Amino acid sequence: RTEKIICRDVARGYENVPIPCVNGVDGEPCPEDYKYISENCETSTMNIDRNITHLQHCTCVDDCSSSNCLCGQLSIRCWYDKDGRLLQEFEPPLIFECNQACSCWRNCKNRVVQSGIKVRLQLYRTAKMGWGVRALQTIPQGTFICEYVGELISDAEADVREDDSYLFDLDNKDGEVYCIDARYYGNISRFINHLCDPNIIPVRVFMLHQDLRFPRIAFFSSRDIRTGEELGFDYGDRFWDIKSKYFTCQCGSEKCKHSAEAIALEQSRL
Amino acid sequence: IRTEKIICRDVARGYENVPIPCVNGVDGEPCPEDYKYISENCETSTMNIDRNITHLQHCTCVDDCSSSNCLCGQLSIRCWYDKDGRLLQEPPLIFECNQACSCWRNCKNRVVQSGIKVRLQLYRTAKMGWGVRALQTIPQGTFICEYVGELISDAEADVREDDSYLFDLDNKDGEVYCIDARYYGNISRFINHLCDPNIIPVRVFMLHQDLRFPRIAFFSSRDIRTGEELGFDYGDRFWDIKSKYFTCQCGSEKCKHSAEAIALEQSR
Numbered sequence: 031r032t033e034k035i036i037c038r039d040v041a042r043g044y045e046n047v048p049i050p051c052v053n054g055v056d057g058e059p060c061p062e063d064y065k066y067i068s069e070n071c072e073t074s075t076m077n078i079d080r081n082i083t084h085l086q087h088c089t090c091v092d093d094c095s096s097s098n099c100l101c102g103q104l105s106i107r108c109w110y111d112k113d114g115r116l117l118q119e120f121e122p123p124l125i126f127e128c129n130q131a132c133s134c135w136r137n138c139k140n141r142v143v144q145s146g147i148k149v150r151l152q153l154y155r156t157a158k159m160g161w162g163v164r165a166l167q168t169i170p171q172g173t174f175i176c177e178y179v180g181e182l183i184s185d186a187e188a189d190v191r192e193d194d195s196y197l198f199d200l201d202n203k204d205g206e207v208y209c210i211d212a213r214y215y216g217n218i219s220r221f222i223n224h225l226c227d228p229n230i231i232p233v234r235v236f237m238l239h240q241d242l243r244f245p246r247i248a249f250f251s252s253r254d255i256r257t258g259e260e261l262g263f264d265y266g267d268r269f270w271d272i273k274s275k276y277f278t279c280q281c282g283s284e285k286c287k288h289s290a291e292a293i294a295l296e297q298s299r300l
Numbered sequence: 301i302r303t304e305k306i307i308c309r310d311v312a313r314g315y316e317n318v319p320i321p322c323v324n325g326v327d328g329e330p331c332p333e334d335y336k337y338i339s340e341n342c343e344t345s346t347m348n349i350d351r352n353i354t355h356l357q358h359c360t361c362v363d364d365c366s367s368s369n370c371l372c373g374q375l376s377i378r379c380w381y382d383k384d385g386r387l388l389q390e391p392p393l394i395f396e397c398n399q400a401c402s403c404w405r406n407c408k409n410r411v412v413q414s415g416i417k418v419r420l421q422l423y424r425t426a427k428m429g430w431g432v433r434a435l436q437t438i439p440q441g442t443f444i445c446e447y448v449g450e451l452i453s454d455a456e457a458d459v460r461e462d463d464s465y466l467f468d469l470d471n472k473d474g475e476v477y478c479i480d481a482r483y484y485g486n487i488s489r490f491i492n493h494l495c496d497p498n499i500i501p502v503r504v505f506m507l508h509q510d511l512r513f514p515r516i517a518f519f520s521s522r523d524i525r526t527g528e529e530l531g532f533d534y535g536d537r538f539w540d541i542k543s544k545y546f547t548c549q550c551g552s553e554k555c556k557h558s559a560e561a562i563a564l565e566q567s568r
């Protein structure tokens with residue numbers, strides 16, 4: 031079967047690079063049951079707090095490469111190297127990027143996620159998991175890949191929605207909990223599958239606002255990724271505790287944690 | 301004889317598509333720093349701008365939105381864009397395409413949201429403080445820049461001390477809002493008044509359609525040559541207030557607000 035190129039760019043020119051779609055597996059058409067958006071949207075009043083006087087910001091007169099940058103100090107257990115790659119000390123990490131209130135320039139060293147997608151990605155048809163996303167180039171460890179983009183909703187709204195296959199919990203620790211639902215509006219990340227041996231990790235980030243209800247979700251590679259490799263992250267135990275009643279994991283890894291056999295083995299261990 | 305110094309390579313600190321340098325060949329005034337340069341409008345208290353994506357009128361085009369079937373073009377009042385992104389023209393009102401439209405980000409109805417493309421310079425004028433001039437030929441109808449600043453209510457505008465950078469959105473229907481570029485603004489805060497203007501402000505909607513908050517886009521009203529100072533007609537309301545404190549220095553043969561013009565109007 032020929033691998034048919036079925037869309038030149040599912041993002042319609044909204045990303046820095048096109049994201050084509052191919053299907054060399056079956057007759058499924060390019061997915062159109064959602065609206066591609068490159069940035070989060072709202073379908074009710076969220077009214078993000080963008081008060082420029084509310085932003086913590088730096089006074090750097092350099093490129094924000096020094097440890098004296100306030101924005102770098104606010105970041106929790108992570109930092110960017112000179113090439114824009116994320117390093118972590120391993121409480122989850124939290125990135126405060128520079129913003130419109132900082133004295134620094136738009137091209138300072140603390141601007142990775144807000145600068146958008148730089149790697150070549152492809153939406154493709156997987157053998158067993160529906161659509162997936164793969165790299166069209168080698169990607170070094172720590173590289174920004176893409177953001178989890180969708181519809182901002184409250185946790186109460188997330189609990190009542192019927193299709194939970196695209197729901198990302200922001201897991202707010204101080205205040206009400208919010209979610210990003212990519213079922214109806216989303217970007218390329220809605221197609222990233224779960225892998226028990228993941229090669230990307232989600233990290234919460236603040237950029238042009240510091241409204242604590244709404245960290246933005248940035249995926250970074252957790253190891254060097256080879257051309258053609260499917261991208262995947264660990265959806266987490268909570269997802270699988272709910273979804274395993276309907277389907278089990280087909281990642282195929284020797285260390286798979288969510289297959290029918292793994293679940294039975296975990297039930298025996300407990 | 302003073303010669304011109306380049307005193308800032310980019311007053312926008314990299315936030316625009318192009319650098320906007322500042323020069324001074326007139327006096328010793330340093331690069332203006334009594335404001336914060338921002339490339340897009342800000343809030344210091346919330347305006348509750350309606351950003352609900354389901355409230356956007358949007359088109360179903362899959363071409364470049366150049367056809368008469370484009371709903372977004374049909375919404376725009378008394379104006380349209382040509383194939384080169386230039387504006388042709390009750391004041392006009394532009395509805396650009398947005399994130400709800402089915403078209404691509406590079407369609408023909410995206411001029412203002414795509415940002416500054418012409419080369420501009422902040423420079424020290426002889427008699428009007430800082431001004432902005434063209435560094436290139438700018439054909440008639442070309443987008444120049446947006447009037448960017450702090451969104452404030454009419455009540456807040458009334459109590460503000462310095463109104464030299466206050467732009468009234470002229471909401472003819474309901475709630476009244478202003479853009480104050482005194483404390484936060486972009487290059488447009490430095491554009492002076494000309495009685496022979498060469499740019500015009502146009503109200504535009506892009507990523508939201510909250511009709512209380514049109515964004516203000518400047519387009520050239522004629523072909524502009526390199527070195528010409530950019531200027532719009534601030535309007536009679538500004539001058540009815542300000543002429544008691546200073547008169548117009550634009551130098552036009554048909555200046556409407558000079559000491560000479562004021563003396564004639566008082567003679568009547």
Ligand SMILES: Cc1c(C(=O)N[C@@H](CCC2CC2)C(=O)Nc2ccccc2)[nH]c2c1C(=O)CC(C)(C)C2
Pocket residue numbers: 122194195196197198199200201232233234247264265266268269272
């Ligand atoms: C993986 C993750 C989550 C997270 O929501 N996963 C999702 C699964 C992935 C989503 C694409 C589909 C999830 O559980 N959906 C769900 C839960 C219950 C019922 C239905 C769906 N939220 C955080 C993480 C983190 O790793 C750290 C964090 C601080 C960024 C917080």
Ligand SMILES: Cc1c(C(=O)N[C@@H](CCC2CC2)C(=O)Nc2ccccc2)[nH]c2c1C(=O)CC(C)(C)C2
Pocket residue numbers: 391463464465466467468469470501502503516533534535537538541
């Ligand atoms: C020129 C203009 C305005 C407008 O606010 N001018 C300003 C002057 C220019 C501003 C940089 C300083 C103004 O009056 N300031 C003012 C008045 C009184 C006291 C203090 C300051 N508002 C519209 C226009 C239009 O041409 C049409 C429009 C629909 C875009 C609506």
Ligand SMILES: Nc1ncnc2c1ncn2[C@@H]1O[C@H](C[C@@H](N)CC[C@H](N)C(=O)O)[C@@H](O)[C@H]1O
Pocket residue numbers: 158159160161162195196220221222223224225277278279280281
């Ligand atoms: N490891 C996995 N094993 C089995 N199914 C998966 C796995 N990862 C993702 N899926 C499927 O993909 C859904 C999650 C979506 N966010 C991912 C894109 C999805 N594959 C699609 O075609 O739209 C899940 O609810 C499953 O249907």
Ligand SMILES: Nc1ncnc2c1ncn2[C@@H]1O[C@H](C[C@@H](N)CC[C@H](N)C(=O)O)[C@@H](O)[C@H]1O
Pocket residue numbers: 427428429430431464465489490491492493494546547548549550
């Ligand atoms: N035609 C003019 N004649 C005299 N002063 C002007 C004229 N146009 C603008 N100005 C001055 O500039 C102010 C408006 C500002 N938005 C323009 C930038 C200002 N020239 C500056 O140096 O900051 C007015 O309040 C005046 O002080």
Ligand SMILES: [Cl-]
Pocket residue numbers: 319320321
């Ligand atoms: Cl330059």
Ligand SMILES: [Zn+2]
Pocket residue numbers: 088089090093094099100101102128132134
């Ligand atoms: Zn800094």
Ligand SMILES: [Zn+2]
Pocket residue numbers: 088090093094128129132134135138139140
């Ligand atoms: Zn910085």
Ligand SMILES: [Zn+2]
Pocket residue numbers: 087088089094099100101127128129132133134140
């Ligand atoms: Zn900073």
Ligand SMILES: [Zn+2]
Pocket residue numbers: 225226279280281282283285286287288289
């Ligand atoms: Zn697995």
Ligand SMILES: [Zn+2]
Pocket residue numbers: 359360361364365369370371372373397401403
């Ligand atoms: Zn259209």
Ligand SMILES: [Zn+2]
Pocket residue numbers: 359361364365397398401403404407408409
């Ligand atoms: Zn369009």
Ligand SMILES: [Zn+2]
Pocket residue numbers: 358359360365370371372396397398401402403409
């Ligand atoms: Zn449109």
Ligand SMILES: [Zn+2]
Pocket residue numbers: 494495496548549550551552554555556557558
């Ligand atoms: Zn004049």
